[PDB]
Symmetry: C2
């Protein structure tokens, strides 16, 4: 039983979702740039709408597109958006911060931890930018930071996820159930099952997951 | 002389703005779909940042891309986003609602008027979708609804704004100072001056206005 997560932009396509197949949705806007934090109205209404249909909501916390190297003002934005996301009863927060050298910016993330108020945390696709050699350590760091899961593609150049099986499986084995691994990027209703059984992953993310 | 409005997506490109040339900014996100309501954090920080530099902020109120024919839930989203925009000291609200027959949905707009709490209101590019024959009446309706200005391109098929001079001028003359007309869509630092003098328009909107 693989857990499927639908990646939505606002609540336009939510009316066809069914908890029987989709258990969670990643709520964001601007998917053209990879997804950003949706408006307050969208978060409040989507959460109530989805909860009503029995589906969890993971809110995207990203101040804009491009880099994952945020300046002070952008971090101030993210902290604010996190406070609202929690007061609006969001089930999870999706974020990702990296240093100029493509490593996990632990200090920046710790600055936002208090605002998270214990809600489940997920590190997004920014994980793939991390050099493959520092990948495993990053997992340990995410575990130490209290993160619940990691959404990754297995590569950063956009190659077919099907060719990242070996690497993704190594990450799952190394994670050793200390944190959940979720596959995303090119994950559809045609390959999500195969990819999961060959890697040991039990969660799939995608805009065309169904 | 001519008032220039910069169309921004979040606050990434705001650091170079100067009140000496840009007096107002239209704040939104997801410009790929024409612009939607930005996150709460972006509105709060952008308003404080821009006000600090002496520039007004018009916040986009649009629950998603595509149509301007909103369902009840989407109208609930817009009312919520309007309440937040005002409590965050926004200077203006940008919205646009149309009926299935491409006419101004007066009843829907009136439902949101109370939440606006008197802030200046602007009707966006959705105005161009209105059949050219019902264009002038729409202006009267916007005046009756208490709107401050209208952002329009002068055509709905995306033709060069330079070819809409005659129509745009007719709208300005008909508006007769009862409401401000602002040009947008293909308006750059190379044609905004010419377009304004030939139409009588005194305000220009654009991502490349400078």
């Amino acid at each position: 039983m693989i857990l499927r997560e639908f990646c939505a932009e606002n609540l336009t396509d939510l009316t066809r979702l069914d908890k029987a197949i989709i258990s969670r949705v990643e709520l964001c806007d601007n998917l053209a740039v990879g997804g950003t934090t949706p408006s307050y109205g969208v978060i409040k209404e989507a959460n109530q709408y989805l909860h009503e249909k029995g589906i969890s909501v993971a809110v995207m916390i990203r101040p804009r597109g491009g880099n994952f190297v945020y300046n002070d003002l952008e971090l101030r934005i993210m902290e604010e958006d996190i406070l609202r996301a929690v007061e609006l009863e969001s089930d999870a927060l999706v974020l990702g911060i990296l240093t100029s050298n493509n490593h996990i910016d632990t200090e920046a993330i710790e600055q936002l931890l208090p605002a998270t108020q214990g809600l489940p945390l997920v590190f997004h696709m920014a994980f793939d930018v991390i050099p493959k050699s520092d990948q495993k350590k990053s997992i340990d760091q995410l575990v130490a930071l209290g993160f619940t899961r990691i959404l990754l593609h297995g590569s950063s150049n956009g190659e077919p996820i099907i060719e990242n099986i070996k690497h993704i499986k190594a990450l799952v084995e190394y994670a050793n159930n200390r944190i959940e691994i979720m596959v995303g990027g090119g994950v559809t209703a045609e390959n999500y099952q195969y990819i999961c059984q060959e890697t040991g992953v039990k969660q799939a993310h995608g805009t065309r997951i169904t």
